Symmetry: D2
Subunit: 100 residues, 4 copies
């Protein structure tokens, strides 16, 4: 790959923003705050694609705890996470899950 | 501390089984099947490889939240410590488990 | 190319790497890694295989007892053998292997 | 809290310094190229490894590093290294203990 795959756990800093590509593919962006314990927080901008993007826009909001795995990138400088998988954390919440 | 931390993504093979220790700490166990896939260029199709199975255990509040939220067949993402134990075999000591939103939505409720 | 379980393991070689070749003549080196948590705890043992140039570099550079860091893909193979014995092996398909500098130095020569 | 693995080449020779207590600490910058844009991370390793690094590694060399991803100050992302290895992808190594 040359890709840097990582996992991050934290809380959304903001509600997800849903956009679309020219082909009509959904893309949702949101910032995650990961806090080591409180030490200084790691903030990462995440983007989620396709169906997951819509499930995220609908299901998630500021303050919710997530676990995300994706590919770490740097843009020209901001560091970003291209998310491959996103889950609503069950650490301190329950979920009623509905298959799309 | 020299622990081997890994992230696994897949479907629950069975309903989580919830038990308690003598001190009263909740513990939920369940098996995750993670299926790799490769694109077959000649047939123009994604073909599935052999599934990776791991027995997971989650502790305390998370354990009860799992017993309440997850069922057989649901997709999850888990991060935790890879262990093998007594013959030896593998097990994941879960530090964090999430219900995947890849192809589902969720109503989330704190605590 | 999808749904793979990528992991990093750190530990010592249990044995000298075993160098073999595929029918096409590609090198492949197998070695088992022993990862021991300090929390000494029970060690995690994982069979690794590395390919091509790295495999040769490994056979040449590493031996039993040396400390490595490896990143690769965790796979499961389950089968019934010619004698009716049902078995399963887990294996780390290595993408990157490094000689650890935690308690060693190294003279590094590019191939 | 956020442990990651990164693979790449040293942008520069490692810089060895010491703290008031005499603890060694080595800093180097890794470039990880997916060619697309490169991910650049400043790495620091402590103690014996810091010294082994200063003696073993130089700019251009390929490494694999595992450690804790941190952010500071605008801001920059740093890797607090728990483990660093000289990659054998396109190199051989003569390895010596301690």
């Amino acid at each position: 790959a040359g890709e840097t795959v990582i996992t991050v756990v934290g809380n959304l800093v903001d509600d997800p923003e849903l956009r679309f590509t020219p082909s009509g593919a959904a893309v949702a962006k949101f910032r995650v705050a990961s806090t080591p314990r409180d030490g200084e927080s790691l903030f990462l901008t995440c983007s989620v694609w396709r169906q997951a993007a819509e499930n995220v826009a609908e299901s998630l909001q500021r303050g919710m705890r997530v676990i995300v795995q994706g590919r770490l990138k740097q843009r020209s400088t901001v560091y970003e996470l291209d998310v491959d998988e996103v889950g609503a954390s069950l650490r301190s919440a329950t979920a009623k899950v509905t298959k799309t």
